[PDB]
Amino acid sequence: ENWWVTVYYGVPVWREAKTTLFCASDAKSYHNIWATQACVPTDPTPQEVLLPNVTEEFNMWENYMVDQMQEDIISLWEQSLKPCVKLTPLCVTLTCNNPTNTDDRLGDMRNCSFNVTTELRDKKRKVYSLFYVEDITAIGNNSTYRLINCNTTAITQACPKTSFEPIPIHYCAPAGFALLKCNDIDYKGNETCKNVSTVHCTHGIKPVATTQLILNGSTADNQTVARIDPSENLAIIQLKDPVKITCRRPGNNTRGQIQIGPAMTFYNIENVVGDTRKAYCEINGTQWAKALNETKEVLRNILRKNISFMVPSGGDPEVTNHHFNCGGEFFYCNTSEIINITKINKTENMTIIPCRIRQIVNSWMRVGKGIFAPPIRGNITCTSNITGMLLEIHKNREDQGEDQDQNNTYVCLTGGNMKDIWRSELYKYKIVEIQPLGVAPTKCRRY
Amino acid sequence: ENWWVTVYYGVPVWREAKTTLFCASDAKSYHNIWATQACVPTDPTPQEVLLPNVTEEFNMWENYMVDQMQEDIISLWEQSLKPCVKLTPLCVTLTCNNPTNTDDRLGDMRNCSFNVTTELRDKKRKVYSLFYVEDITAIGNNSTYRLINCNTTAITQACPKTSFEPIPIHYCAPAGFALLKCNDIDYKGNETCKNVSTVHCTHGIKPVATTQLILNGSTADNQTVARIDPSENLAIIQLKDPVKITCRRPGNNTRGQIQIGPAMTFYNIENVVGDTRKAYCEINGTQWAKALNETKEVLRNILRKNISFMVPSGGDPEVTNHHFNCGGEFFYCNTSEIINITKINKTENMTIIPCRIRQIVNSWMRVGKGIFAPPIRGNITCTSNITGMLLEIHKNREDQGEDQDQNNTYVCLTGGNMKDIWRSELYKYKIVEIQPLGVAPTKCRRY
Amino acid sequence: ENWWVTVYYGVPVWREAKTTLFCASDAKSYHNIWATQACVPTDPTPQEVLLPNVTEEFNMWENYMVDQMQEDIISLWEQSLKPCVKLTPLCVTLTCNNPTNTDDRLGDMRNCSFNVTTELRDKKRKVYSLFYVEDITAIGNNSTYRLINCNTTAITQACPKTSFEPIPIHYCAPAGFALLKCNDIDYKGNETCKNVSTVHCTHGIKPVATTQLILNGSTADNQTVARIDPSENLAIIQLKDPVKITCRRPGNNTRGQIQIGPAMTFYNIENVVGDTRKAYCEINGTQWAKALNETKEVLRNILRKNISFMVPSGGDPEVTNHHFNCGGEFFYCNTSEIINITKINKTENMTIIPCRIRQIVNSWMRVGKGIFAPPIRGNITCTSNITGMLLEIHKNREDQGEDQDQNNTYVCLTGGNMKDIWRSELYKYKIVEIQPLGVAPTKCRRY
Amino acid sequence: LGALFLGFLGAAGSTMGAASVVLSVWGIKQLQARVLAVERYLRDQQLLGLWGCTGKTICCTAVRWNKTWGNISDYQVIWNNYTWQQWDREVNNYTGLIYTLLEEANTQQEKNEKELLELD
Amino acid sequence: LGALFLGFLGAAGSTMGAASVVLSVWGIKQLQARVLAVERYLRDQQLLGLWGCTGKTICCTAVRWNKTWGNISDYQVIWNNYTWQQWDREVNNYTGLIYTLLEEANTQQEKNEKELLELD
Amino acid sequence: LGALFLGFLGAAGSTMGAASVVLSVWGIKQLQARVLAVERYLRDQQLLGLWGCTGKTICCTAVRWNKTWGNISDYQVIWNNYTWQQWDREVNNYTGLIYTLLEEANTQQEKNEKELLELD
Ligand SMILES: *[C@@H]1O[C@H](CO)[C@@H](O[C@@H]2O[C@H](CO)[C@@H](O[C@@H]3O[C@H](CO[C@H]4O[C@H](CO)[C@@H](O)[C@H](O)[C@@H]4O)[C@@H](O)[C@H](O[C@H]4O[C@H](CO[C@H]5O[C@H](CO)[C@@H](O)[C@H](O)[C@@H]5O)[C@@H](O)[C@H](O[C@H]5O[C@H](CO)[C@@H](O)[C@H](O)[C@@H]5O)[C@@H]4O)[C@@H]3O)[C@H](O)[C@H]2NC(C)=O)[C@H](O)[C@H]1NC(C)=O
Ligand SMILES: *[C@@H]1O[C@H](CO)[C@@H](O[C@@H]2O[C@H](CO)[C@@H](O[C@@H]3O[C@H](CO[C@H]4O[C@H](CO)[C@@H](O)[C@H](O)[C@@H]4O)[C@@H](O)[C@H](O[C@H]4O[C@H](CO[C@H]5O[C@H](CO)[C@@H](O)[C@H](O)[C@@H]5O)[C@@H](O)[C@H](O[C@H]5O[C@H](CO)[C@@H](O)[C@H](O)[C@@H]5O)[C@@H]4O)[C@@H]3O)[C@H](O)[C@H]2NC(C)=O)[C@H](O)[C@H]1NC(C)=O
Ligand SMILES: *[C@@H]1O[C@H](CO)[C@@H](O[C@@H]2O[C@H](CO)[C@@H](O[C@@H]3O[C@H](CO[C@H]4O[C@H](CO)[C@@H](O)[C@H](O)[C@@H]4O)[C@@H](O)[C@H](O[C@H]4O[C@H](CO[C@H]5O[C@H](CO)[C@@H](O)[C@H](O)[C@@H]5O)[C@@H](O)[C@H](O[C@H]5O[C@H](CO)[C@@H](O)[C@H](O)[C@@H]5O)[C@@H]4O)[C@@H]3O)[C@H](O)[C@H]2NC(C)=O)[C@H](O)[C@H]1NC(C)=O
Ligand SMILES: *[C@@H]1O[C@H](CO)[C@@H](O)[C@H](O)[C@H]1NC(C)=O
Ligand SMILES: *[C@@H]1O[C@H](CO)[C@@H](O)[C@H](O)[C@H]1NC(C)=O
Ligand SMILES: *[C@@H]1O[C@H](CO)[C@@H](O)[C@H](O)[C@H]1NC(C)=O
Ligand SMILES: *[C@@H]1O[C@H](CO)[C@@H](O)[C@H](O)[C@H]1NC(C)=O
Ligand SMILES: *[C@@H]1O[C@H](CO)[C@@H](O)[C@H](O)[C@H]1NC(C)=O
Ligand SMILES: *[C@@H]1O[C@H](CO)[C@@H](O)[C@H](O)[C@H]1NC(C)=O
Ligand SMILES: *[C@@H]1O[C@H](CO)[C@@H](O)[C@H](O)[C@H]1NC(C)=O
């Protein structure tokens, strides 16, 4: 007989789809820009289920979750700077000079006096300030200085009570969608996983905005891996060994207040008190030697060519420098010395990377929403881990003239996208939609 | 026996109700103010169902869809001018004169130099501009000119990447509501239709904001019709024959840039290059003769009186002039000559309507949100169809003194409302609500 | 046998929960800040159901509805001042003097001329105004006056078409929640009620923002009651007898207009015309004698100590004064004389409280959103009822040195919170959640 | 998009006895209209649920039809000469009465006789 | 406006055995509260759906009542001397156990014996 | 939080024949995703409602299985050697046909024979 139609309902059928995810945060709420607020509290039980005999393909380089989370971070960053004060009337001609008098922060600072409008809208008065030299450009043949980004974009300072600390954020799917997770010890990037398990929520992701180096990230568990774009521009290296990095800015900063307008309270770097030593970062050279010597072979076995490095060319501190976010400060660090480890590993003491402080940031080179950093009073350090790098693929044997066999010329080591970090944490997860209807033939027949 | 109660569920019962409609756009998205964005893509199958033996009354002059779509267009127009720059600091005393030296655009333009604040907030500099004379009024006994609308309302210029092109928009009802459509070859306005069919979505409506004449509209299919308000103020004429109209502004316009503030980039009409001929429109006189001679009889059979026309009185270019939107420009056209077709149809060559350019528009005489038109670089023409007119009912035999039998004195031909155009495209559609419950007596009885 | 499981569904089970309530307004809509708009119209049938044999405890001092309605009033007050004009450019040096020449309003007003920027952004002109002395502070040794709150917060004036009239607002629970209401003739504040009834909607609450005295409120029905916090700071007195109070400001005020900017139309108190008598309030002394003599015993029986009163100390008109909202004006009234009724009740004529007018209010001492009061043209009075007071608990026998047995030193009689009024109207209502599932053992067994 | 509704009202002009059954800005518009349609559907499921008819399209009951319930004549004329728009005028004034009598006669009259007259 | 709920809780103070069944700012408040009420209703329909009771108000089942499930005495005393607020205290600690045993004993114990013991 | 869904897909890798049944920013995300999940569930209830299967998990019907409906062999091989992901590929191209034939064969073929062949 024709085995008649049955309709089940507990039916596990997948369809690949795109939808909106949502928060899961740990219960640590006490404004810390990501705010731990209007954000779903986590479930105490991490609920996953294994899926044997499952052969599932999912692509890293087309993952919708990455663009979802980039748009989330951009909209959150925009919302967090909304109630703070604008810094429009500070654009004014600046009468500057040297403040007063190797490794001196005062040499990289200028003392600038200027007229500001008070709360009376008529009586301008002369106040003074200190600024770092990389936020000031010139006009004339004497002092006559411009505060930078008065022709490009508007600048708003941050509210001082906020913190830039990256909290962990889990992503979860709404009910009616599932999150497939691979569990292989390595993943090439775009193939079929074997040990696949579903899970209701991802692991914690700290939105650490940076470049040249991935910080506080997830480490691989057998060997350092090289997730490569299809020879497009770049390749994400994920180390096994976390490499410790410390960064320091010593001394205090006396902070004043200037009333620009009604409740428009500019914060001023009034004086540098404690120590004049520049901001610097410090890593262990042997660990970095092992990490680079591992990364060379991991790229070498796949690209079949012997690996070189090249110092980045002149230009944007998007690509020439490192870009931390330590406390309420923004470090631009000169890493053109640290990729030379044959010389560097001789010194058994430690190595030093010099860094510079920036107050004015056109945010993250993709948002560009001009944020004026509030001055942080205090002796400040921060330490973190080095887990990943964003290397750029070398230029082929058509652009460099000399041989590019055995001479893989990594002319830069950068990625300007904040998105590419977020590709290095969501290489495991796929959003699927359940189709619970089902149609089958069967023995029965309804009367 | 008492035939017991049954409850059906597939029950077609109508109730007239009011609710919120939504978009259906064609898949042409490539910002073109209506934006084709956050707007539902259309269904490829136009789904309608005929409804025989249906006698349904629906009123044109109380249609909720018209006010719905007016509020949609006003809120969309307000949203589209939000991210663009304000033009507040341009209000300043203007030192103007003739630029340099019949049918000359430079005679209707003034060369105005003025002091503007730069990006430094102290160093004002002298820049210059060109403006049309109908956007400038006087102060003193020499040059001393005011930019218009510095005492009435705030002015924001439009972003230059936007386009004012009317895209087609379908309206559809949500699930749980139906759209009744009449299909009679004529419709008086407020009676019972016979050939009625339901449809999920309306036909495409281009929101063409204009007056004196309805452009790119729907044409009647047997004869020109006269949908009249209850002798209230006006009457909508819908022609059968679409009448071609072309409009031209020849020559280029050299465009400059002026930095008002941080990313406050004013666009300036720097120079007129190509040709000095004024902007003009051109129609075929014979087609217009046939259209007016048809419209006179269509009004004559209904209002029982012989038809006259009168030139509009002095006053607002809301009512005295035509109001296009050709490209990124706003044409005010003098139509007081074209309603005289007995003289006009002698010239077999063509006829010419002169038009003037306006940069500053208090938007659409009902929104009033002051938009500064961006300068359009380029030789520019646009052609369109004439499908409908918005005539005003003549004044009775109490106001004009002379006889108003045989002398229907159309003292104006206007409608200042953008709403009345939208009444001329939604005379077919009614929103109804389905009541699917149903209660009937029947033979059965449940055990 | 084990009586098998049944599952009912019409199951009345309570759980205490927190959720969002919503509007019910009377159909009086004709903008009157609370606006009677986007607000649900009331049901004509007040639907309640009695609940016998119900012993329910609910706490007044932890009621979520109070914080809900405070956040509603604050967000509504913020929304209502959004489309009105800012008053930023009015902050300017003021050249003031006496206008021209006991109980004279002109003695408490100053004539202030100042330069304001016109619509031309260059030509400042000299205009003049009148202001009350409590909105102006000094700079120098002659005239040289500051408009107040140019260093604290931004000031926006109200739109003149709005009204500050307290409309009644009912609160209702959404479907799936119920509102428990006590009906005892007295309620201590935190115990178990007996006559409990559910209701879909609360009674009408007029959001009358005030202090020192509760106006247009609900009265107790057997005796005046004293709802006390756990000796924390204060105690709410609810009278039985409503005490009539009238307040008057006689005479007209000639009002002018000043164009600050584009559609920035400041309203000016140009001249005082009719009568020079100060604004004053008037109450019957015998009724107030009875009310105080009742309140002393109601506090005396509970706190076991003989009752005193003390004049409030020097400081903020938050606490030193009364704070009405009569029409479009803000009265600050000096009530330090009226709590002495042994002297006061001798005069059988009436008693007079002097009051002062304020134009600039940092709103309600908890919002603080600086509102400039628009000038009200006209002879103006308003009458109301006195139903409740917000007394502060006396300081113990550790702070005052002298005995505090028989000497309950009410050093203030205040509450600065607008929340505490709203605790005096929602002492009856609890939000509960229905759990309609139910599980029971029963005789049956399903085949 | 509701994708859930039945009764596309096509044969409404035909005789009632022989029909016998059929078969940003716009983002806020969607998020309002979907919720409106969902709640309006669930109200119909609640009136259908309390009548012992969840899942059926056509039901019978035990409630007799009063001859005051509308203008009563030969009922075969009512089937043969009316449509739903014509009969729905005569349905009104009798909405809440029948909609309470059905909920009484199903969930109370049948369930009590199911649980008490039959012990199991 | 929900217009969908049952059980207006009036006879709650009476004895459980004899009740036997009953029968802008505010725009964002509406658009939140309607969705909350709809989802809270559908959760009750899901717990009622997996027990083979969609559309009924009163059900029986095959699951025996354990004498550890709450403080167990003569059950007629439980019907005669309690209300729902009193019995609901004793209902707790036994929520998920019974709510899993019912879903096991209906959709698995009845359906397998329907499809396998009866071949058709 | 949906708290309403069934089928947590755990035994999907096992054989289909032996599975046999299982058992601000984020505020706008919630208010969108809840409505999406509710409407997506109600669409499944509508396809299940018109088949005479509201409340059941497993149904039979009267519709015969065509041997053109997918690649047809011994059906016991289909139960023993496939999973739902494998069978769902062969389900497609036959979606709307079967989903119209079921709605015809339940609400019209059974209800007419219930009301007309049986007079009561
Ligand atoms: C990779 O991961 C690592 C590991 O997490 C990251 O390192 C962390 O970096 C954080 C900074 O971004 C560090 O937080 C600061 O820690 C300081 C020292 O904390 C000591 O005490 C705490 C106990 O409280 C203890 O756990 C810790 O181990 C240390 O012993 C703090 O002083 C500092 O306070 C900052 O915040 C306050 C106010 O903020 C408070 O409230 C917030 C909510 O609004 C809340 O989120 C905060 O946690 C905090 O409770 C702020 O006022 C301070 O500024 C001045 O304050 C007063 C004047 O007001 C003045 O006296 C003082 O000197 C300050 O000048 C201050 O900015 C932070 O909490 C964290 O400790 C680091 N973790 C480790 C293990 O070292 C690393 O950053 C990551 N990598 C990258 C690239 O991000
Ligand atoms: C009644 O209905 C009629 C029929 O539709 C309406 O007439 C139409 O009016 C439109 C203007 O409102 C016309 O559009 C312009 O057409 C120009 C010529 O197009 C030629 O080429 C196209 C193929 O691309 C072909 O189909 C056509 O027939 C012509 O042969 C275009 O040059 C002009 O471009 C404008 O837009 C660009 C950028 O905009 C682009 O992107 C938008 C999305 O953001 C998209 O919506 C646009 O379509 C477009 O793709 C803009 O940069 C141009 O401005 C300058 O650009 C460069 C410098 O950047 C400079 O070199 C150049 O010279 C310009 O100065 C430009 O403004 C428009 O697409 C349309 O063609 C007319 N249709 C017909 C049949 O004639 C009539 O308007 C209606 N009545 C009323 C009252 O509205
Ligand atoms: C405790 O409860 C009591 C009892 O309600 C409260 O007393 C009420 O206080 C209100 C003020 O807040 C009083 O309202 C004003 O009443 C005036 C006199 O009304 C007479 O006529 C009405 C019939 O219309 C009659 O019922 C009444 O008994 C009186 O005989 C009105 O003149 C005054 O008008 C105000 O509003 C207009 C415009 O507002 C209109 O439109 C609003 C919607 O936008 C609507 O809400 C309003 O009701 C009103 O219809 C405004 O233009 C006026 O201002 C000037 O207007 C022209 C120039 O434009 C000028 O000629 C005129 O002289 C004004 O200078 C004006 O501000 C109010 O309606 C109410 O009458 C009081 N009730 C009683 C019984 O006395 C008490 O306030 C409460 N306690 C507290 C602390 O609040
Ligand atoms: C910096 O300031 C803190 C307190 O503000 C003080 O304890 C510390 O000694 C200071 N450090 C130096 C180097 O002056
Ligand atoms: C690198 O590898 C290539 C083989 O691809 C080899 O020819 C070359 O000599 C190697 N160079 C070094 C330095 O090992
Ligand atoms: C206008 O400019 C375009 C290019 O910008 C050029 O091709 C054209 O010839 C110009 N027309 C005139 C009349 O100069
Ligand atoms: C117009 O019609 C009227 C009849 O209503 C007639 O008396 C009059 O003479 C006509 N005039 C012309 C010019 O045809
Ligand atoms: C106040 O003005 C009103 C009209 O504006 C007038 O009727 C009234 O007499 C005036 N009162 C005095 C005291 O001048
Ligand atoms: C007030 O009451 C106390 C008892 O607590 C008593 O000792 C005292 O004398 C009383 N004083 C007066 C003035 O009645
Ligand atoms: C006008 O003022 C007089 C006394 O100045 C007062 O008696 C009368 O009540 C007032 N009228 C109004 C409407 O305020």
Q: Find, among A348, A424, A337, the residue nearest to A386 by Cα.
A: A424
Residues D25 and B72: beta-carbon distance below 8 Å = yes
CB contact under 8 A, B120 and A93: yes
Residue with tokens 């605790």: C423
A305 lines ligand 5 (CB under 6 A): yes
Which ligand is closest in space to the CA of residue A301? 5
CB contact under 8 A, D23 and F104: yes
Mutational pocket test of ligand 3: of C205, C382, C383, the residue with most ligand atoms within 8 Å of the beta carbon: C382
Residues C370 and C360: beta-carbon distance below 8 Å = yes
Q: Which amino acid is at B54?
A: V
Q: Which two tokens stand for residue F97?
A: 């046909």
For residues B82, B85, B87, B90, the Cα torsion angle rounded to the nearest 10 degrees is: 170
Residues B220 and B237: beta-carbon distance below 8 Å = no
Residue E78's alpha-carbon distances to A34, C53, C413, E59, E83, in angstroms, are 53, 17, 54, 19, 9
Q: Is C293 helix (H, G, I), strand (E, B) or coil?
A: helix
CA nearest to F116 within chain B = B444
User: Strand A145-147 and strand A5-6: pairing?
Assistant: unpaired
Could you tell me the distance, in angstroms and rounded to a whole number, from the CA of residue B248 to the centre of ligand 2? 14
Q: Which two tokens stand for residue C98?
A: 């006496």
Q: Which two tokens stand for residue A273?
A: 């008190």
CB contact under 8 A, F40 and A53: no
From chain D, pick out residues whose CB is under 8 angstroms from the CB of B6.
Answer: 58-61
CA distance B143 to B146: 10
Question: How far apart are the CA of C122 and the nearest CA of chain A, in angstroms?
Answer: 14
C317 lines ligand 8 (CB under 6 A): no
Q: Which two tokens stand for residue C269?
A: 């108190």
Instruction: Tally Cβ neighbours within 10 Å of residue A55.
Output: 10
Q: What 3 state SS string does F35-52 have?
A: HHHHHHHHHHHHHHHCCC
Instruction: Looking at the CA of residue B275, tell me the nearest atom of ligand 6.
Output: 13
Q: Is A200 helix (H, G, I), strand (E, B) or coil?
A: coil
C199 alpha-carbon distance from chain centroid:
26
From chain A, pick out residues whose CB is under 8 angstroms from the CB of B119.
Answer: 91, 150-151
Residue D5 lies in a domain: no
Residue D86 lies in a domain: yes
Could you tell me the distance, in angstroms and rounded to a whole number, from the CA of residue B273 to the centre of ligand 6? 9
CA distance B326 to B216: 12
Q: Which positions 60-89 of C are in contact with A (Cβ < 8 Å)?
A: 88-89
Q: What 3 state SS string does chain B have?
A: CCCCEEECCCCCCEEECCCCCEEEECCCCCCCCCCCCCCCECCCCCCEEEECCCCEEEEHHHCHHHHHHHHHHHHHHHHHCCCCCECHHHCCCEEEECCCCCCCHHHHEEEEEEEEECCCCCCEEEEEEEEEHHHEEECCCCCCEEECCCCCCCEEECCCCCCCCCCCEEEECCCCEEEEEECCCCCCCEEEECCEEEECECCCECCCCCCCCEECCCCCCCCCEEEECCCCCEEEEEEEEEEEEEEEECCCEEEEEEEEECCEEEEEEEEECCCCCCCEEEECHHHHHHHHHHHHHHHHHHHCCCECCCCCCCCCCCCCCEECCCCCCEEEECCCCCCCHHHHCCCCCCEEEEEEEECEEEHHHCCCCEEECCCCCCCEEEEEEEEEEEEECCCCCCCCCCCCCCCECCCCCCCCCCHHHHHCCCCCEEEEEECCCCCEECCCCCC
Question: By the CB < 8 Å criterion, does B43 face chain D?
Answer: no
All residues at 6 or more sequence positions from B365 whose CB lies less than 8 Å from its CB, including other chains: B316, B318, B416
Question: How far apart are the CA of B228 and the nearest CA of chain A, in angstroms?
Answer: 50
CA distance C402 to C108: 40
Give the DSSP per-residue string, C155-201: EEEPPTT-------BEEEPPTTEEEEEE--S---SEEEESSEEEESB
Residue E1 lies in a domain: no
Residue with tokens 């096994």: A240
Q: Which two tokens stand for residue C354?
A: 């002097």
Which ligand is closest in space to the CA of residue C252? 8
CA distance C302 to B235: 79
All residues at 6 or more sequence positions from A334 whose CB lies less than 8 Å from its CB, including other chains: A320, A321, A322, A353, A354, A355, A356
Residue E17's alpha-carbon distances to D113, E11, E23, E84, E88, in angstroms, are 16, 11, 16, 10, 14
CB contact under 8 A, D6 and F108: no
Beta bridge partner(s), residue B215: B386
Residue F54 lies in a domain: yes
CB contact under 8 A, C262 and B93: no
CB contact under 8 A, F27 and A442: no
CA nearest to E36 within chain D = D35
A383 lines ligand 5 (CB under 6 A): no
All residues at 6 or more sequence positions from A279 whose CB lies less than 8 Å from its CB, including other chains: A105, A247, A248, A249, A331, A354, A355, A356, A357
Q: Is A263 left (phi over 0), alpha (psi -120 to 50) or beta?
A: left
User: Largest Cα–Cα distance in chain D?
Assistant: 61
Q: Measured on CA atoms in the order A328, A332, A334, A339, is the torsion positive or negative?
A: positive
Could you tell me the distance, in angstroms and rounded to a whole number, from the CA of residue C332 to the centre of ligand 10? 21
Instruction: Tally Cβ neighbours within 10 Å of residue A11.
Output: 24
Cα–Cα–Cα angle for A86, A89, A93, nearest 5°? 140
Q: Which two tokens stand for residue B406?
A: 């045989």
Residues C289 and C341: beta-carbon distance below 8 Å = yes
Residue F1 lies in a domain: no
Q: Find, among B41, B72, B67, B59, the residue nearest to B201 by Cα.
A: B41
Residue D9 lies in a domain: no
The structure was resolved to a resolution in Å of: 4.1
CB contact under 8 A, E35 and D32: no
Q: Find, among C345, C324, C300, C41, the residue nearest to C210 by Cα.
A: C324
Q: Which two tokens stand for residue D105?
A: 């006669």
CA nearest to D18 within chain F = F112
Classify burial at C123, counting beta carbons within 10 Å of its beta carbon; exposed 0-12, middle 13-18, buried 19 or more: exposed
Q: Domain A5-83+163-434: which topology?
A: HIV Envelope Protein Gp120; Chain G (2.170.40)
> What is the rounded radius of gyration, in angstroms, for the C-alpha atoms of chain B?
27
Q: Find, among C435, C436, C429, C434, the residue nearest to C172 by Cα.
A: C429
Q: What 3 state SS string does E87-117 have?
A: HHHHHCCCHHHHHHHHHHHHHCHHHHHHHHH
Question: By the CB < 8 Å criterion, does C447 face chain D?
Answer: yes
What angle, rounded to 10 degrees, do the helices at E25-49 and F25-49 form? 40
Residue E3 lies in a domain: no
Which ligand is closest in space to the CA of residue C307? 9
CA distance B233 to D52: 58
Most A-contacting residue of E115, E117, E118 (CB-CB within 10 A), to test interface? E115
E and B touching (3 or more beta-carbon pairs closer than 8 Å): no
Domain boundary among D16, D32, D60: D60
A130 alpha-carbon distance from chain centroid:
29
All residues at 6 or more sequence positions from C66 whose CB lies less than 8 Å from its CB, including other chains: C419, C422, C423, C426
Q: Find, among B194, B411, B391, B427, the residue nearest to B298 by Cα.
A: B391
Residues A130 and A110: beta-carbon distance below 8 Å = yes
Experimental approach: cryo-EM
User: Strand C22-24 and strand B48-51: pairing?
Assistant: unpaired
Q: Is D95 helix (H, G, I), strand (E, B) or coil?
A: helix
Which ligand is closest in space to the CA of residue B250? 6
Residue with tokens 């006991």: C102
On the CB side of C168, CA atoms within 13 Å amount to: 15
C252 lines ligand 8 (CB under 6 A): yes
Residue F87's alpha-carbon distances to C54, F72, F84, F92, in angstroms, are 59, 11, 5, 9
Q: Find, among F34, E42, F79, F88, the residue nearest to A437 by Cα.
A: F88
CB contact under 8 A, B12 and D21: no
CA distance B438 to D16: 11
Residues C309 and C413: beta-carbon distance below 8 Å = yes
Q: Find, among A286, A285, A276, A287, the residue nearest to A253 by Cα.
A: A276
Same domain for D30 and D83, yes or no, is no
Residue F2 lies in a domain: no
Beta strands in A214-350 (DSSP E): 214-215, 225-228, 234-249, 253-261, 264-272, 280-283, 322-323, 330-333
CA distance F27 to F30: 5
CA distance A27 to A36: 8
- In terms of residue numbers, what domain contains E37? 10-117
Say which DSSP state A232 is in.
Answer: S
Domain residue ranges in chain A: 5-83+163-434
What angle, rounded to 10 degrees, do the helices at E25-49 and D25-49 form? 40
